[PDB]
Structure 1
């Protein structure tokens, strides 16, 4: 029965119940249903008008908190002598909820999510005075042509949604829409992306938002700067389906749900909850 629930439910008073046939404490877990034993039906209650709002447990309010999804300190200098592995004043980033575990465990509570990403790009700068650098954050789709240089002609943004912003400005906030080809983001994808057997397991590219190619629009300055670009994603307009067990073991990788666990309890493989002495030993005991 679907009903609008704004506050937690009231408790009716109850009296002495001595009745054959009606055993409300006795329930069947084997049916899979959670026990419907009301607190009135189990113990003797008073009338309580419960005014506690349930609004902070809304899945919209649960997940619409702008959490960190990307962070790169990258050097901002002459890159004529640097190696061809570091960021030559730009970084591509396939937009990925899996990189940071606080938002990842929250989004992996559910199986399917339908949200709009409210990407806030916080750029901060340190010296190896601070410059007022202008940054471009060109939104490239999944697999499309990502730039090769800082001053390459992919940054002209004929159709890719670039956002130009400065360090001295407030952080650039754009709204990435619901960009899955399916009706929800498959947070877990039990299956393979490709038709051949070489495809990566669990990684649905429909779950992938796209690339976030971020460069610094200014040319290279005679001193080098370490520019750290933090990206904050706020899921919004959130519809969520099929909740899951929250992940207890520590994450190993962003590409999959591999597990190793801690060496000892808590959150270990053989023992998730921290150990105690016996089953009849109370750890936090009020001894006076």
Structure 2
């Protein structure tokens, strides 16, 4: 059934059992069911009123934490000098959530997750060290982060005219302010996001290039620029994006990833050269199956 569990189960008292036809400690793993043997019928227990809560381990609390999803640096100077005719004080990012393994492995514990995304943008700034690198403080620059859905025009320069954003949502935030924050809704075309897609994203049967690419994971692009014109000195802007999911719903739990990730587009694996986390040996080796590695020397 479905039970509400604010705390864990109590233990009840138990007594000597010597019955014919009753075998609580005997199971059958072939049925696909986990053993139902309880501690009170395995051993002679005392009563214990147990008040250990279960709130910290809720799925909403397990996943509802901000983690790094994107980080990228770019130069803030005058790039028009030379053979480059475009200002280029900006960058473009195609939104994905598979770039950093910490959040990725925590998401891939489920096949489908439905959540709203709380996005936090953390800018940092440094002064480039070259020749006349006489420090004069970090300027208080204003930055524009524009969400660009699929099919919308994408800026090609800092001074492009796509930055008016009559329809595209933008945030203007300064270096010295608190981090910018906004919520993206649950914006999938399906009922949930798929962490895994066992299929192809194209009707055409190409030989390779489209396995595991989910058609619905086309969230679009994030373009971030510096609104100010170039200063006489060059600075380096680093933008870190934190994603916190909320209102979370998760289905179909999966085995956690054990091999190190290799790409953001597939589940390819190689492991380490030796245990632990090796393609032949996930757990480290002990001398034999009769060896405690950490044994009390009495």
TM-score normalised according to structure 2 size: 0.93
Matched, 1:98 2:108: no
| 8 A contact 1:187–1:207 mirrored in 2 | no
Q: Distance in 1 between matches of 2:14 and 2:102?
A: 43
How big is the shift at 1:237?
0.6
Contact (CA 8 Å) 1:8, 1:52: kept in 2 or not?
Answer: yes
Quick one: which of 201, 218, 222 aligns to 1:212? 222
SS of the equivalent of 2:198 reads coil
Question: Is the counterpart of residue 89 in structure 1 residue 89 in structure 2?
Answer: yes
Q: Structure 2: any 5+ residue segments left out of the alignment? A: 129-136
Contact kept in structure 2, 1:265 and 1:272, CA below 8 Å: yes
Structure of larger gyration radius: 2
> Are 2:87 and 2:158, in contact at CA under 8 Å, matched by a contact in 1?
no
Distance 1:270 1:107 in 2: 25
Structure 1 unaligned runs (5+)?
none
Distance 1:265 1:179, change over 3 A: same
Once residues 272 and 36 of structure 2 are traced to their aligned partners in structure 1, the CA distance between those partners, rounded to angstroms, is 37
Residue 131 of structure 2 corresponds to none
| 8 Å Cα contact 2:87-2:159 kept in structure 1 | no
Matched residue count: 287
Is 1:245 matched with 2:255?
yes
Q: What is the CA distance between 1:225 and its match in structure 2?
A: 0.5
Whether 2:259 is the aligned partner of 1:231: answer no
1:113 matched to 2:126: no
Partners in 1 of 2:108 and 2:151 — Cα distance? 24
Asked whether the 8 Å contact 2:10–2:50 carries over to 1, the reply is yes
**Which residue pairs with 1:20 in the alignment?**
20
| Aligned residue among 173, 181, 196 for 2:189 | 181
Equivalent residue, structure 2, for 1:279: 289
What is the CA distance between 1:82 and its match in structure 2? 7.0
2:158 corresponds to which of 131, 147, 150 = 150
CA offsets, 1:27-51, max 9 Å, x none? Answer: 1110111111111111111111111
Deviation at 1:177, TM superposition (A): 0.6
- Equivalents in 2 of 1:37, 1:89: separation in Å? 65
Task: Find out whether 1:194 has 2:202 as its counterpart.
Answer: yes
Alignment of 1:79 onto 2:79: yes
Distance of 1:247 and 1:97 partners within structure 2 = 15
Q: Secondary structure at the match of 1:106?
A: helix
**Deviations 1:168-200 (CA, angstroms, capped at 9, x unpaired):** 000001101101000000000111111112352
Q: What is the DSSP-based 3-state SS (H/G/I as helix, E as strand, rest coil) of the residue aligned with 2:60? A: helix
